[PDB]
Write a protein that binds this DNA or RNA. Sequence first.
DNA 1: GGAGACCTGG
DNA 2: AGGTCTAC
Length: 313
Amino acid sequence: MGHRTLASTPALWASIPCPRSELRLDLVLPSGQSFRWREQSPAHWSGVLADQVWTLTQTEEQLHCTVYRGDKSQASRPTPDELEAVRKYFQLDVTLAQLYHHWGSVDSHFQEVAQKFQGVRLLRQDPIECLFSFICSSCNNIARITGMVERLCQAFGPRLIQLDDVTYHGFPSLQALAGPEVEAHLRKLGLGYRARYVSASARAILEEQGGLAWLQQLRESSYEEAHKALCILPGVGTKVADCICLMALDKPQAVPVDVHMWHIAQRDYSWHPTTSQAKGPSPQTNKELGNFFRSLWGPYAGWAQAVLFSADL
DNA sequence: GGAGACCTGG
DNA sequence: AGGTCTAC
Ligand SMILES: [Ca+2]
Ligand SMILES: [Ca+2]
Ligand SMILES: [Ca+2]
Ligand SMILES: [Ca+2]
Ligand SMILES: [Ca+2]
Ligand SMILES: [Ca+2]
Ligand SMILES: [Ca+2]
Ligand SMILES: [Ca+2]
Ligand SMILES: [Ca+2]
């Protein structure tokens, strides 16, 4: 039957109470947090969630979900325990209306731009997929990172199911990305120099850092200790380590600084470096810029920057 | 201690 | 192009 829509198979969908002001799929799913979601049908997004294939769509007050179990099982709507994984992925316990109010009460520029861009939250992504997707993000654009990640998963990820002419693949494991000749195979997929960092980082984790448990246990650590620990890996710098902290290690205060953050700080805030004579982007100045937005937005500054990014584009 | 080379679609 | 690394 292929990809389902809300009107195609009514009996196979389950609803989660969720207004559009708490979440907008079209603003978080292709916005550069995850690269493995596709709007196959209008207002219907499909991707891999908790090692299974889901299709999501939202009305005005409900979030409709359906899960594909294939011929292995019988076609049935998602169970209550299955819907809990969807809630955790979107971190629905974090209320956006409250965050928007706190940011708007301490930032006049925030209220003027966030009123039209609501429902911009942050996904809780798996550390493995997040670390390697953003290793490929160096000198890249969203359209190209999406291509590399898709090819990488097709060649090294386990096959799940096939819907229409699409075969969904889970993310590759550490053992697969550390195997022999992985970097040569990845370079034929267009990854460029990033093919070495993927193979090197996967081997450094398994053979020098203690394995997968070392990466996942950075969730318990502090932001400073997790950032320094990530920068050990080859190809992981300050910008990449901040993205993984913010999107996979539950560090909402992480603010990845780049040229986009500089244009916003200078135009909408007249910001300028004071702890460094350098007037442009630099290691000393980029750390000062991250602190400025942490001191101005609070412990959820990373979530606030996601809202300003969606309003700029 | 605060400029290169590295890969590629453009 | 949601930069990192070696070098000096
Ligand atoms: Ca209910
Ligand atoms: Ca898994
Ligand atoms: Ca895939
Ligand atoms: Ca830091
Ligand atoms: Ca590093
Ligand atoms: Ca560092
Ligand atoms: Ca202003
Ligand atoms: Ca550029
Ligand atoms: Ca950006």
